[PDB]
From a paper:
In view of the ∼1.6–1.8 Å distance of the two atoms, we propose the ligand to be either a ferric hydroperoxo intermediate (Fe–OOH−, also referred to as Compound 0), in line with previous investigations on chloroperoxidase, or a peroxo ligand. Importantly, the structures of the A and B molecules in the DtpAa dimer in the asymmetric unit differ in the conformation of the amino-acid stretch made up of residues 217–230 [Fig. 2(c)], which either lines up with the central β-sheet covering the distal side of the heme in the A molecule or is a loop bulging out of the active site (B molecule). Wilson plots calculated from the calculated intensities after the final stage of refinement are not affected by these complications; they solely reflect the falloff of Bragg diffraction with resolution (as the atomic model only accounts for this and not for other effects), and modern refinement programs calculate Icalc on an absolute scale. Icalc-based Wilson plots for the ID29 100 × 100 µm and the Cristallina-MX 100 × 100 µm data are shown in Fig. 12(b); a clear difference in the falloff of Bragg intensity with resolution is immediately apparent. To check that these are not spurious effects due to a difference in unit-cell parameters, we refined the 100 × 100 µm ID29 data using the 100 × 100 µm Cristallina-MX cell and found a change of only 0.03 Å in either parameter, much smaller than the effects seen with the actual data sets. Thus, the observed differences in the structures are not due to differences in unit-cell parameters but are due to radiation damage. Moreover, we observe an increase in the FeOOP displacement for the ID29-derived structures compared with those from the XFEL data, which is also much larger for the B molecule than for the A molecule. By comparing SFX and SSX data and the derived respective DtpAa structures, we see indications that local and global damage occurs at ID29 during the 90 µs exposure.
Author numbering:
A (entry chain B): 55 to 417
B (entry chain A): 55 to 416
The structure:
């Protein structure tokens, strides 16, 4: 459990084991030159091969010419690879550049406006994303800081989010993590072991209509604030009725164990699990891979905390869109607000040492 | 994942080995009722005994009356104590309430203005603080959230700071961590095992003039922004000349190993280590216990990066103040800006199960 292989038919960081920490960054492109952007994707891919093996970028962090800036900023020296994965994605706004408008996938759909949205434009969208996941947050931050530095003059950082899940040194791998509302989160999800369910619900197929995306996936990111101080004043019964599971064991109502299959008719009609379940959505099923956040306190002394929701799917129109539409009457809506949003096409994997991020799109 | 003992002559979270994560909160007091404030300190102490042992506060996180809110918010259920420490401090502004004016320690000094200061008043000061440190960020957030909930109507959060990784060491036997400039930070500190140096430089003594503070310490907090665009285009030689140590090993200039003693005359006259060293400051020595932070982007296309600097000392006048005055000509000033400040009196330890935070003052 020290490194995750970078090369594959698929990018790592989707179906590979969930790491303890997240640094997610969205970038905007500042160049109009296609050749200069392809050169960056090749340099970024070379850096990512070094970073995911626990090596410094370029000629290293020290021991070069004294009169040159070092190639690597040095804050990860002495740390382990920490299961780092680096996953790149392309936003809809990238396809307005470089003559790409006819290669935007139909599955990379713009999201509709949903009831109760309060999206901050500054923390939404982006031409590009890099998802950096690792067990050590300094390994993740060092990766984003050095990719941003390599890209300076061709890309800028639009927005950045730090996140946390479990701490693996102290918490067993099989234990479901709790979200900041104190409920177990992830019980009924697609697991990385389920190869057929990934082919059906997560990976883009050649016959889906966009050949360059074969073996890729589609990502939806939502920054969802929780109203923590309001939630903490709710009764135990009110909290359990919102979800349709009990708080201690996380069993479905009228069942005994966390992994018992739910009986949807025993839950309240607007309970979150009942509305989100595939049987309520024509079989629509998601891979959730999100992380908790706590950024600090706002001007009223309230905790700025919530869930940085990440979902992967074969098609945004048949995954996130139908399920989020069905949450229009969710009992949870009283306690949350969606304040950031973005969608990305995540290309296929880097096949070998000579391949590079985006090679199927750019040629 | 083990517990750090909560009781002692001193509070834990100072000499204790430095934990991976920080959640620091400053609170302002909103009650004028002395008895109501004393009742809060006792309830907070009872909660801290549970939290530091990995137990839920009050009657627990579930299995109570369905129609009542749970006593514990529940997001730490099934987690280990994770070396949680909870350290309380009292700000100078507290002493204007509850008839405490004559008990303000002389050693709790207001800081002067320093050249280059750009202090945000909203994220400075505070009537009191809680430093939560743990190896698990969820355990630290759970502690601050449950203390703030218990204090509803008597205290409000003024400002908070999360630290994602440590930039300090009280354990010279373990690897020294790096700050976001890529240098080891904590080589020449005070170790938790150096009992003589802790008595000389960190713990307040009865003869210092404030009996209620005997066994306590004084805390300076400084929020420091880093100019990483400016730093990352500097040459390797410029970076090493700024500090007086090499970047790869962290050895003093000319020497082979991190822990070899500095030879100050080989460093540039404005080198950070040369200006900050005790021999440059009449023997003034600090216990540094800070953490790195990043709070998103700056809105100008760049990552935000900084260091939340924490120093403990026996007297602010003989610790932080002379060292920071000597840093007026530091080469590092080109790459940093102080943007937040606070000082606190950290009372003595909770002696046993009948004692309570602040009992020697109140
Ligand atoms: C802060 C926001 C949210 C919280 C706190 C939350 C919490 C939970 C919890 C506690 C569960 C039950 C345990 C489990 O199976 O994971 C659950 C299930 C689920 N949630 Fe949410 N959720 C949130 C937002 C969303 C959103 C935005 C979507 C999709 C658009 C979503 C889709 C689901 C799905 C599909 C399930 C599994 C239902 C099943 O098949 O049984 N959730 N969520
Ligand atoms: C962003 C701000 C700062 C950075 C990046 C930084 C960095 C460093 C580094 C790399 C070292 C050498 C390794 C070590 O012995 O710890 C060091 C030493 C030291 N720093 Fe700083 N520092 C900063 C701010 C401060 C401040 C504000 C003070 C006190 C007012 C301070 C006091 C010291 C002391 C006392 C030493 C040890 C010198 C010795 O005895 O050898 N530092 N710092």
């Amino acid at each position: 459990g020290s490194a995750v292989p970078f090369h594959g038919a698929h990018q790592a960081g989707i179906a590979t084991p969930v790491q303890d920490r997240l640094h997610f960054a969205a970038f905007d492109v500042t160049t109009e030159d296609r050749a200069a952007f392809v050169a960056l994707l090749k340099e970024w891919t070379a850096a990512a091969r070094r970073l995911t093996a626990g090596h410094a970028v370029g000629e290293g962090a020290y021991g070069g010419l004294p009169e040159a800036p070092p190639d690597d900023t040095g804050e990860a020296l002495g740390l382990k690879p920490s299961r780092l994965t680096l996953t790149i994605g392309f936003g809809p706004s990238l396809f307005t550049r470089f003559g790409l408008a006819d290669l935007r996938p139909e599955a990379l759909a713009d999201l509709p406006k949903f009831p109760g949205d309060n999206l901050d434009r500054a923390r939404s969208g982006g031409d590009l994303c890099v998802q950096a996941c690792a067990d050590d947050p300094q390994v993740a931050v060092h990766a984003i800081r050095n990719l941003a530095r390599i890209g300076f003059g061709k890309v800028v950082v639009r927005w950045s989010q730090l996140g946390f899940g479990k701490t693996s040194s102290t918490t067993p791998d099989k234990q479901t993590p709790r979200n900041l509302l104190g409920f177990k989160d992830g019980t009924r999800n697609i697991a990385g072991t389920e190869k057929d369910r990934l082919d059906r619900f997560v990976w883009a197929a050649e016959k889906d209509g966009t050949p360059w995306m074969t073996g890729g996936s589609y990502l939806v990111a939502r920054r969802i604030r929780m109203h923590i101080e309001t939630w903490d004043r709710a009764s135990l019964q009110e909290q359990e009725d919102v979800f349709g599971r009990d708080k201690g064991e996380g069993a479905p109502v009228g069942k005994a164990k966390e992994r018992d299959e739910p009986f949807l008719k025993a839950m309240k009609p607007d309970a979150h699990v009942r509305l989100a379940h595939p049987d309520s959505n024509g079989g629509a099923t998601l891979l959730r891979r999100g992380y908790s956040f706590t950024d600090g306190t706002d001007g009223l002394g309230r905790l700025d905390a919530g869930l940085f929701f990440l979902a992967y799917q074969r098609d945004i129109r048949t995954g996130f869109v139908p399920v989020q539409r069905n949450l229009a009457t969710d009992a949870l809506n009283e306690y949350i607000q969606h304040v950031g949003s973005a969608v990305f096409a995540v290309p296929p994997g880097v096949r070998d040492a000579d391949d590079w991020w985006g090679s199927t799109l750019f040629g």
